[PDB]
Amino acid sequence: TISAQVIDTIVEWIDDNLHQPLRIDDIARHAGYSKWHLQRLFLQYKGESLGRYIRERKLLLAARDLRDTDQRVYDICLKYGFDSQQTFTVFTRTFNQPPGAYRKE
């Protein structure tokens, strides 16, 4: 029990939520835990900054949609959180693996 069961709710919010980005103000509210209700968790349970963990989660989620043989490549990053194609093109810094070649795999 950390901050009255915030771990059991963060995962549910990440699962249920739409492609809306996750920031301090966005998740600070209906979360039931403010900035410090999340800082301790991100420091202890995860040990990684939000901008990298969210990007990794989006990449792991899109790894299946890229294999689902979808022709609308521009909408793949949009349906998962990346509001722009250039920002998602994160993939170069993470995998150094072609968008298209991976999409071909």
Added chain:
DNA sequence: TTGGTTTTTCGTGCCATAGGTTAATGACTTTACAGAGGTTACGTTTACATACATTTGTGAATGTATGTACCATGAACGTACCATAATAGAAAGA
């Protein structure tokens, strides 16, 4: 000419120096419970005078008690309506 690795800023995240509301046991203090002490107005126990009753003798009410000496010689002394048929009894002729 186009995709992707490399690099630098920059707002954002993590760490550290400051300074204030407010949990701690307490010390409170206030209310409640526990201690004896003088006073009140009864409740039980006791003696004493007078009263209804109940216990005695005495004057009247009834009640059996034995008899009355001219002559009195049998009757119901006034009852009563008379229905109808099963079962025996004492005799009489069969």
